[PDB]
Amino acid sequence: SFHRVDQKEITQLSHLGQGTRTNVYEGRLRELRVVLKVLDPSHHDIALAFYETASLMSQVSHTHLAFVHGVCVRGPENIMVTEYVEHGPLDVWLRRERGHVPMAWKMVVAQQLASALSYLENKNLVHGNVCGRNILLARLGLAEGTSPFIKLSDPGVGLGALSREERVERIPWLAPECLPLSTAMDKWGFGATLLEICFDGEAPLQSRSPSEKEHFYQRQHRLPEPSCPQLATLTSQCLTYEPTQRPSFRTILRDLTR
């Protein structure tokens, strides 16, 4: 159950990057500013999972969830059409602007992200790809008199269909119980994303090889506590290996607002 987008209705512009089994381009939709996520040549089950993401994210709404417009099926190309959010991914922005972003700014985006994930929890819908790359900046909020505004993008190809190798590369955003689907995984993803934001877009463990990322989870080592000193109790509660011990998003949002 998703919108079929006819190929006459879209224009493809420049290449922005590569997502999980995708090439991502800027585009136009007749007009709206969009991103075009072109799937790799794939087995039908990967294409199904791609369609499933588009279907689920088409039937939810939130101020801090980016729009999904539909899928264009050119034969045998599959292209998801989604919102272009003006200032792009949070991780790249933070790295370019590092040492100019105050703590108070970071508290605002954490609250906004927790709001969106509170709604998804209430809807009992798994995201499965909460990370800096999928947080998009609609307003910058650094100028005097302003505050930032973010949007969480769709998860792309559903986590359930990816290979073990791909799951290892998503450490430490990936919930440990997903290494060998519940809404509990998104608590861990959220916690990992808060560390990423606090470290100015440098996630922990990203200078290490895949086998060393996996080994860290095998031993069950505890991730570092944030440079944002207020957040430490919260990130550690989110990043606990036992999923049932992680707090609800009602509790997370409540604690962040004060």
Side-chain angles (χ1 to χ4, degrees), residues 44-58:
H44 198 239
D45 294 356
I46 299 299
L48 284 173
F50 205 55
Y51 302 152
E52 179 170 34
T53 293
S55 195
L56 277 318
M57 301 307 144
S58 290

PDB file of all heavy atoms in Angstrom, residues 44-58:
ATOM      1  N   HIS A  44      14.528 -10.247  -5.317  1.00  0.00           N
ATOM      2  CA  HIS A  44      13.174  -9.743  -5.115  1.00  0.00           C
ATOM      3  C   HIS A  44      12.828  -9.451  -3.651  1.00  0.00           C
ATOM      4  O   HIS A  44      12.045  -8.552  -3.393  1.00  0.00           O
ATOM      5  CB  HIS A  44      12.132 -10.682  -5.733  1.00  0.00           C
ATOM      6  CG  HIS A  44      10.798 -10.036  -5.943  1.00  0.00           C
ATOM      7  ND1 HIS A  44       9.639 -10.511  -5.363  1.00  0.00           N
ATOM      8  CD2 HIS A  44      10.444  -8.932  -6.644  1.00  0.00           C
ATOM      9  CE1 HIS A  44       8.626  -9.735  -5.711  1.00  0.00           C
ATOM     10  NE2 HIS A  44       9.089  -8.769  -6.485  1.00  0.00           N
ATOM     11  N   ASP A  45      13.413 -10.202  -2.719  1.00  0.00           N
ATOM     12  CA  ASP A  45      13.208 -10.005  -1.274  1.00  0.00           C
ATOM     13  C   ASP A  45      13.753  -8.674  -0.721  1.00  0.00           C
ATOM     14  O   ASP A  45      13.223  -8.142   0.264  1.00  0.00           O
ATOM     15  CB  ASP A  45      13.832 -11.154  -0.467  1.00  0.00           C
ATOM     16  CG  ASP A  45      13.147 -12.508  -0.717  1.00  0.00           C
ATOM     17  OD1 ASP A  45      12.129 -12.582  -1.449  1.00  0.00           O
ATOM     18  OD2 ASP A  45      13.643 -13.506  -0.160  1.00  0.00           O
ATOM     19  N   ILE A  46      14.819  -8.167  -1.330  1.00  0.00           N
ATOM     20  CA  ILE A  46      15.361  -6.860  -0.977  1.00  0.00           C
ATOM     21  C   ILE A  46      14.421  -5.789  -1.490  1.00  0.00           C
ATOM     22  O   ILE A  46      14.124  -4.836  -0.769  1.00  0.00           O
ATOM     23  CB  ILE A  46      16.766  -6.622  -1.569  1.00  0.00           C
ATOM     24  CG1 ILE A  46      17.767  -7.670  -1.052  1.00  0.00           C
ATOM     25  CG2 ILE A  46      17.254  -5.205  -1.267  1.00  0.00           C
ATOM     26  CD1 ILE A  46      17.984  -7.688   0.444  1.00  0.00           C
ATOM     27  N   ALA A  47      13.965  -5.943  -2.734  1.00  0.00           N
ATOM     28  CA  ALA A  47      12.974  -5.032  -3.304  1.00  0.00           C
ATOM     29  C   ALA A  47      11.684  -5.003  -2.482  1.00  0.00           C
ATOM     30  O   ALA A  47      11.126  -3.924  -2.254  1.00  0.00           O
ATOM     31  CB  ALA A  47      12.682  -5.363  -4.757  1.00  0.00           C
ATOM     32  N   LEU A  48      11.216  -6.167  -2.029  1.00  0.00           N
ATOM     33  CA  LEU A  48      10.023  -6.233  -1.159  1.00  0.00           C
ATOM     34  C   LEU A  48      10.197  -5.437   0.144  1.00  0.00           C
ATOM     35  O   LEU A  48       9.300  -4.696   0.541  1.00  0.00           O
ATOM     36  CB  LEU A  48       9.658  -7.687  -0.811  1.00  0.00           C
ATOM     37  CG  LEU A  48       8.968  -8.511  -1.902  1.00  0.00           C
ATOM     38  CD1 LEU A  48       8.837  -9.969  -1.458  1.00  0.00           C
ATOM     39  CD2 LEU A  48       7.606  -7.922  -2.260  1.00  0.00           C
ATOM     40  N   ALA A  49      11.343  -5.620   0.793  1.00  0.00           N
ATOM     41  CA  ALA A  49      11.689  -4.896   2.011  1.00  0.00           C
ATOM     42  C   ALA A  49      11.756  -3.373   1.779  1.00  0.00           C
ATOM     43  O   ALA A  49      11.265  -2.599   2.592  1.00  0.00           O
ATOM     44  CB  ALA A  49      13.006  -5.420   2.570  1.00  0.00           C
ATOM     45  N   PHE A  50      12.330  -2.967   0.649  1.00  0.00           N
ATOM     46  CA  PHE A  50      12.323  -1.560   0.201  1.00  0.00           C
ATOM     47  C   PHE A  50      10.889  -1.020   0.076  1.00  0.00           C
ATOM     48  O   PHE A  50      10.583   0.051   0.612  1.00  0.00           O
ATOM     49  CB  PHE A  50      13.032  -1.454  -1.153  1.00  0.00           C
ATOM     50  CG  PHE A  50      13.620  -0.101  -1.468  1.00  0.00           C
ATOM     51  CD1 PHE A  50      14.509   0.517  -0.601  1.00  0.00           C
ATOM     52  CD2 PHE A  50      13.371   0.499  -2.697  1.00  0.00           C
ATOM     53  CE1 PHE A  50      15.094   1.724  -0.932  1.00  0.00           C
ATOM     54  CE2 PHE A  50      13.954   1.713  -3.038  1.00  0.00           C
ATOM     55  CZ  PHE A  50      14.803   2.327  -2.148  1.00  0.00           C
ATOM     56  N   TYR A  51      10.021  -1.766  -0.621  1.00  0.00           N
ATOM     57  CA  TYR A  51       8.597  -1.391  -0.737  1.00  0.00           C
ATOM     58  C   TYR A  51       7.898  -1.340   0.627  1.00  0.00           C
ATOM     59  O   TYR A  51       7.067  -0.473   0.872  1.00  0.00           O
ATOM     60  CB  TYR A  51       7.802  -2.368  -1.612  1.00  0.00           C
ATOM     61  CG  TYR A  51       8.245  -2.579  -3.044  1.00  0.00           C
ATOM     62  CD1 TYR A  51       7.984  -3.800  -3.682  1.00  0.00           C
ATOM     63  CD2 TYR A  51       8.872  -1.575  -3.785  1.00  0.00           C
ATOM     64  CE1 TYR A  51       8.361  -4.026  -5.001  1.00  0.00           C
ATOM     65  CE2 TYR A  51       9.259  -1.796  -5.105  1.00  0.00           C
ATOM     66  CZ  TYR A  51       8.995  -3.023  -5.705  1.00  0.00           C
ATOM     67  OH  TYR A  51       9.358  -3.267  -7.009  1.00  0.00           O
ATOM     68  N   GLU A  52       8.239  -2.282   1.505  1.00  0.00           N
ATOM     69  CA  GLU A  52       7.648  -2.336   2.834  1.00  0.00           C
ATOM     70  C   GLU A  52       7.954  -1.060   3.633  1.00  0.00           C
ATOM     71  O   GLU A  52       7.059  -0.500   4.244  1.00  0.00           O
ATOM     72  CB  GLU A  52       8.107  -3.578   3.582  1.00  0.00           C
ATOM     73  CG  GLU A  52       7.550  -3.699   4.991  1.00  0.00           C
ATOM     74  CD  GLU A  52       7.823  -5.051   5.623  1.00  0.00           C
ATOM     75  OE1 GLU A  52       8.895  -5.646   5.352  1.00  0.00           O
ATOM     76  OE2 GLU A  52       6.958  -5.524   6.389  1.00  0.00           O
ATOM     77  N   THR A  53       9.201  -0.595   3.608  1.00  0.00           N
ATOM     78  CA  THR A  53       9.540   0.675   4.264  1.00  0.00           C
ATOM     79  C   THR A  53       8.675   1.830   3.736  1.00  0.00           C
ATOM     80  O   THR A  53       8.125   2.595   4.524  1.00  0.00           O
ATOM     81  CB  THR A  53      11.034   1.007   4.110  1.00  0.00           C
ATOM     82  OG1 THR A  53      11.803   0.055   4.848  1.00  0.00           O
ATOM     83  CG2 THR A  53      11.366   2.422   4.596  1.00  0.00           C
ATOM     84  N   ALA A  54       8.558   1.938   2.410  1.00  0.00           N
ATOM     85  CA  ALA A  54       7.767   3.006   1.785  1.00  0.00           C
ATOM     86  C   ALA A  54       6.308   2.953   2.202  1.00  0.00           C
ATOM     87  O   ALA A  54       5.699   3.995   2.441  1.00  0.00           O
ATOM     88  CB  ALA A  54       7.871   2.963   0.269  1.00  0.00           C
ATOM     89  N   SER A  55       5.770   1.735   2.276  1.00  0.00           N
ATOM     90  CA  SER A  55       4.386   1.494   2.682  1.00  0.00           C
ATOM     91  C   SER A  55       4.121   1.919   4.127  1.00  0.00           C
ATOM     92  O   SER A  55       3.185   2.676   4.384  1.00  0.00           O
ATOM     93  CB  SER A  55       4.029   0.014   2.493  1.00  0.00           C
ATOM     94  OG  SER A  55       2.634  -0.170   2.559  1.00  0.00           O
ATOM     95  N   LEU A  56       4.950   1.455   5.057  1.00  0.00           N
ATOM     96  CA  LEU A  56       4.799   1.808   6.487  1.00  0.00           C
ATOM     97  C   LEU A  56       4.988   3.308   6.781  1.00  0.00           C
ATOM     98  O   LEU A  56       4.151   3.918   7.466  1.00  0.00           O
ATOM     99  CB  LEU A  56       5.745   0.977   7.375  1.00  0.00           C
ATOM    100  CG  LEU A  56       5.337  -0.454   7.813  1.00  0.00           C
ATOM    101  CD1 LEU A  56       3.879  -0.548   8.234  1.00  0.00           C
ATOM    102  CD2 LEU A  56       5.617  -1.492   6.751  1.00  0.00           C
ATOM    103  N   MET A  57       6.057   3.903   6.250  1.00  0.00           N
ATOM    104  CA  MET A  57       6.298   5.352   6.429  1.00  0.00           C
ATOM    105  C   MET A  57       5.332   6.269   5.651  1.00  0.00           C
ATOM    106  O   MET A  57       5.313   7.471   5.896  1.00  0.00           O
ATOM    107  CB  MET A  57       7.761   5.722   6.125  1.00  0.00           C
ATOM    108  CG  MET A  57       8.775   4.991   6.998  1.00  0.00           C
ATOM    109  SD  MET A  57       8.491   5.108   8.788  1.00  0.00           S
ATOM    110  CE  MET A  57       9.014   3.491   9.361  1.00  0.00           C
ATOM    111  N   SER A  58       4.539   5.716   4.729  1.00  0.00           N
ATOM    112  CA  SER A  58       3.453   6.469   4.067  1.00  0.00           C
ATOM    113  C   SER A  58       2.200   6.649   4.931  1.00  0.00           C
ATOM    114  O   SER A  58       1.397   7.540   4.665  1.00  0.00           O
ATOM    115  CB  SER A  58       3.025   5.786   2.758  1.00  0.00           C
ATOM    116  OG  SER A  58       4.023   5.900   1.769  1.00  0.00           O
TER     117      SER A  58
END
